[PDB]
Ligand binder design. Structure first.
Ligand SMILES: O=C(O)CCCC[C@@H]1SC[C@@H]2NC(=O)N[C@@H]21
Ligand SMILES: O=C(O)CCCC[C@@H]1SC[C@@H]2NC(=O)N[C@@H]21
Lengths: 121, 114
């Protein structure tokens, strides 16, 4: 359960190198900070707030791509589930990125799997 | 600040945008064939200019669908109409195990809930 995650910060990285730090409360809110490091994308290396909801093993969270350091005129939402892989827990997700193309507004699809990262010294 | 929306499926939401770009409200699901219909669910999200993403976990203690959905899109001003064009994913327990369904919703701006 994402309850296991409650009342503590926990960190998570995806295969494109992005990290998020997330707080899950007992009310099922998700708060955190999202550092994007995926190539081909604006808004990298700078923390973006994030908010979402957890229900048991499922989660969905949201980021708007403005934090005052960089604005990419866009937003992303992710939806997925926690699962145990080997003996790591990860979060499997599909995501959409809504942004301003030059042909017009577009919405790009993709997938991201986040691995739990324990705190390091 | 506060506004109501209905999508092609008859589903309804109310959203407040605060001074930090947070979205808050509730979502009432009316899409045929789905769980968790006709019952308020918490909604949270973020906005950025004309773009937005929001999230719901389908759990309220009246009905838990073991389930969560995220939407991402943009508002556009279609004359008298304002719309939110979205794509969504719904992650849920399927028969094989956990799974993720894709779909799309256009939300029409509701002036005064008719
Ligand atoms: O380029 C932008 O408009 C904002 C950054 C985009 C980041 C996307 S969102 C989904 C995918 N997962 C990531 O960690 N980064 C990309
Ligand atoms: O059946 C469930 O697991 C909960 C109901 C989910 C309703 C989906 S979410 C996306 C689409 N838009 C809606 O207003 N309803 C469906």
């Amino acid at each position: 359960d994402f309850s296991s995650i409650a009342s503590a910060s926990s960190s998570w990285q995806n295969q494109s190198g992005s990290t998020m730090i997330i707080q899950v409360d007992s009310f099922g809110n998700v708060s955190g900070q999202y550092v994007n490091r995926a190539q081909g994308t604006g808004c990298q290396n700078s923390p973006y707030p994030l908010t979402g909801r957890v229900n048991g093993t499922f989660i969905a969270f949201s980021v708007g791509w403005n934090n005052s350091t960089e604005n990419c005129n866009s937003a992303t939402g992710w939806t997925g589930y926690a699962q145990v892989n080997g003996n790591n827990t990860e979060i499997v997700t599909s995501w959409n990125l809504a942004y301003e193309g030059g042909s017009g507004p577009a919405i790009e699809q993709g997938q991201d799997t986040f691995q739990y990262v324990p705190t390091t010294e």
